[PDB]
Every structure is written in C-alpha cells, then in structure tokens.
Amino acid sequence: KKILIVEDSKFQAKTIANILNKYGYTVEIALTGEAAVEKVSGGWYPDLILMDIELGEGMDGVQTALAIQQISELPVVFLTAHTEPAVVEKIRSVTAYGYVMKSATEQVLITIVEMALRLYEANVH
Amino acid sequence: KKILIVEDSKFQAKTIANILNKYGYTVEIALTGEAAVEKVSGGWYPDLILMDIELGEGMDGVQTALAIQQISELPVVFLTAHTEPAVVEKIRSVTAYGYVMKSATEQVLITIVEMALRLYEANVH
Amino acid sequence: KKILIVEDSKFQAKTIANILNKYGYTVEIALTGEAAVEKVSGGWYPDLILMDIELGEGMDGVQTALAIQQISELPVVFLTAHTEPAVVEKIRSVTAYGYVMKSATEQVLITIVEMALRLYEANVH
Numbered sequence: 558k559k560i561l562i563v564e565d566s567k568f569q570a571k572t573i574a575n576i577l578n579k580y581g582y583t584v585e586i587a588l589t590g591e592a593a594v595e596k597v598s599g600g601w602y603p604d605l606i607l608m609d610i611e612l613g614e615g616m617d618g619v620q621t622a623l624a625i626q627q628i629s630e631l632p633v634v635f636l637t638a639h640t641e642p643a644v645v646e647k648i649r650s651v652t653a654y655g656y657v658m659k660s661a662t663e664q665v666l667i668t669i670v671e672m673a674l675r676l677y678e679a680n681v682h
Numbered sequence: 683k684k685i686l687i688v689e690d691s692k693f694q695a696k697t698i699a700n701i702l703n704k705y706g707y708t709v710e711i712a713l714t715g716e717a718a719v720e721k722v723s724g725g726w727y728p729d730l731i732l733m734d735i736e737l738g739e740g741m742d743g744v745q746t747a748l749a750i751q752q753i754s755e756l757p758v759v760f761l762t763a764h765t766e767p768a769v770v771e772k773i774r775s776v777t778a779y780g781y782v783m784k785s786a787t788e789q790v791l792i793t794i795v796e797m798a799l800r801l802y803e804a805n806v807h
Numbered sequence: 808k809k810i811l812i813v814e815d816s817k818f819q820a821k822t823i824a825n826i827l828n829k830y831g832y833t834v835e836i837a838l839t840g841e842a843a844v845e846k847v848s849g850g851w852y853p854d855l856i857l858m859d860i861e862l863g864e865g866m867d868g869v870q871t872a873l874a875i876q877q878i879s880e881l882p883v884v885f886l887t888a889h890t891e892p893a894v895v896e897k898i899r900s901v902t903a904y905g906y907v908m909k910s911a912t913e914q915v916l917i918t919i920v921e922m923a924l925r926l927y928e929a930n931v932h
C-alpha cells in the first residue's frame with residue numbers, strides 16, 4: 558500500500574511518514590499540491606492521500622483533492638492544524654474519508670488510515 | 683446527502699447543523715423522537731440520523747432508532763452527553779454505526795459521519 | 808456477534824467485557840495468545856478480536872494475530888497501553904482494523920468495534 562502525504566511542513570510530513578513506515582506502509586511526500594497533482598497525473602497512483610487542508614502559497618488541500626479526484630477516485634483523508642479549520646465551500650465537491658488533527662495520537666491516525674483503505678475497497682468494488 | 687439531527691436542545695442541534703452545513707450537508711432538525719418518526723414515516727428518508735441518546739420527556743433515542751429501523755434501514759450515529767451513557771438493554775436490537783460525544787471536535791464528528799455514510803453504502807449494496 | 812478479548816490483565820479484559828455486554832455483545836476472554844489460538848483453532852470463531860499488543864511472557868499480540876489470520880480472516884482491533892506502542896516489524900503482515908487505547912472512552916471503543924464489524928462484512932463479501 559502506497560500513501561502520499563501532502564504537507565507544507567517537511568517536518569510534519571516526515572513525522573507522519575515515520576509513523577506510517579512503522580506499520581508497513583511505503584510513503585511518498587509532496588510539499589505542494591502542485592507537486593502532488595504532477596506526481597499522480599504523471600502516472601503514480603497512491604492507495605490513499607493524507608492532505609494538509611491549508612498547504613502554503615500555492616493551491617490549498619481542497620483544490621488539490623478536487624484536481625486529483627478528476628484523475629482518479631482515490632481516498633483522501635485531510636490533515637488539520639486547527640480545531641476548527643478554514644474549509645472552503647468547495648469541500649462540498651470533494652469525497653473525504655476523514656479528518657485528523659496533525660497533533661493526534663498514532664492510534665487515531667493509523668486507525669483512520671486503515672479504515673479509509675478498507676472503506677475504499679468496499680465502495681470501489 | 684440529507685442528515686436528520688434528533689436532539690432535545692435546539693442549541694446543540696443548531697450547533698451540529700452549522701458544522702454539517704460547513705461540509706456541504708443539508709440538515710433537518712427534529713426536537714423529539716416522535717417528530718423524527720413522523721418525518722421519516724411521512725416519507726422523508728435521510729441518508730443518516732444523528733440521534734441524542736437521552737432526548738427529553740418523550741421516547742428516548744434508542745426507542746426512536748428502533749422505530750425508524752422498522753421503517754427503513756438508515757444508519758444511526760448516537761450523540762452522547764455523558765462519558766458513560768445510560769444505554770437501555772434495547773440497544774441490543776438497534777444497528778448503530780457510531781457514538782460521538784456532543785463535546786467532540788469537528789474532526790471527530792465529521793469523520794464519523796463520512797465513514798458511516800460509506801459503510802452504509804457498502805452494506806446496503 | 809461474538810467478541811474475543813485477548814489481554815494479559817484479567818481486570819482490563821473484564822472491564823472491556825462489561826462495556827461490550829452493555830451494548831449487546833457476548834464476549835469471551837483469553838488471557839494469553841496461546842489460549843486464543845487454541846480457542847479459535849479448536850473451532851470457535853469470533854466475529855472480532857480485541858487484541859492487547861504486548862500480552863505477557865508468551866506470544867505477543869502481533870504474533871497471535873498473524874497465527875489466527877492463518878486460520879481465518881477475522882477482524883483484529885489492537886488494544887494499546889502506550890501512546891506510542893512497540894510494534895514489531897511483523898505488523899506489516901497483519902490485517903488490522905484499528906488501534907485503540909485501553910484508557911479510551913466507551914464511545915471511541917464501541918465505535919471502533921461497530922465500524923470494524925461492518926467493514927469486515929463489506930470486504931468479506
């Protein structure tokens with residue numbers, strides 16, 4: 558199973574990657590939404606995307622998710638830095654499998670990943 | 683996707699409705715279980731019910747869920763006000779998709795809603 | 808629905824069993840992984856296993872899960888005592904449906920159980 562982590566902070570991205578590797582996932586990191594779209598449109602399809610909602614100066618996570626979902630129906634779980642995130646109205650067009658705080662425990666993060674992976678297979682069926 | 687919120691406190695119901703609207707859901711509120719049963723038996727079927735366990739002076743949430751589940755297999759997620767809720771023995775007959783604290787974060791609430799919605803399609807298949 | 812709880816502490820196992828009984832589950836407890844494997848290989852198949860990661864002096868929970876998964880594809884949710892558990896590299900070979908802290912609320916525990924039960928049916932389909 559391949560996970561793409563899309564996150565403006567390399568430190569946060571690496572912190573999550575290390576957690577995921579501990580459970581047997583191979584992980585790629587994109588530090589902008591544009592990089593993520595390029596990777597997936599270039600032909601590398603992950604089994605799941607962990608997407609920072611805000612991102613940086615470029616496209617935000619909701620835009621990135623909506624772009625990727627035109628390429629392929631892949632499950633997206635959003636990462637949040639705030640208890641109540643700025644979610645743009647466009648979220649209505651994105652299929653989200655979950656939202657998790659970047660400060661959440663390993664148990665909460667891996668559970669959401671594992672459940673999203675199974676829910677995806679059930680619907681993609 | 684249509685969500686029915688069944689909750690004795692209009693303030694709590696509206697607080698949850700606002701959160702759900704932010705993510706693109708259209709929401710209806712019933713302030714008694716009897717109102718909820720009337721709405722659904724009247725022919726309006728939600729994609730998911732968020733059900734207060736206690737409710738008020740009328741039927742409780744477990745009774746309401748059991749009544750609705752005779753009308754249609756709709757997913758119910760229970761709302762709780764207590765860390766360890768009074769759950770009547772009848773809970774054994776109700777198909778629950780989740781339990782969430784009314785004091786839970788947006789992330790926990792929306793994740794449970796999104797997962798219940800997908801798990802429902804997978805089983806209703 | 809039959810749940811097997813595999814846990815080194817009888818006190819913890821009983822505490823979880825009581826919570827599960829409150830929601831209508833019949834529960835069996837194994838206090839070693841060896842006992843669990845004997846029960847399942849002996850012909851008693853649970854609908855779900857709640858598995859302590861560490862266990863005691865015998866086989867650990869990851870080993871127990873990997874052994875059981877050779878007998879039957881049953882959903883395993885791991886119980887953890889630590890915020891960041893010692894997870895052996897072998898976890899890569901185990902299908903996990905979730906991880907939950909033994910100190911977690913009733914709501915978090917029952918939600919994970921209920922969702923794992925439905926995700927299992929969706930995939931086992």
Ligand SMILES: [Cl-]
Nearest residue numbers: 587588589592
């Ligand atoms: Cl990058």
Ligand SMILES: [Cl-]
Nearest residue numbers: 712713714717
């Ligand atoms: Cl009403």
Ligand SMILES: [Cl-]
Nearest residue numbers: 837838839842
């Ligand atoms: Cl035993």
Ligand code: NA
Nearest residue numbers: 682804807932
């Ligand atoms: Na089918």
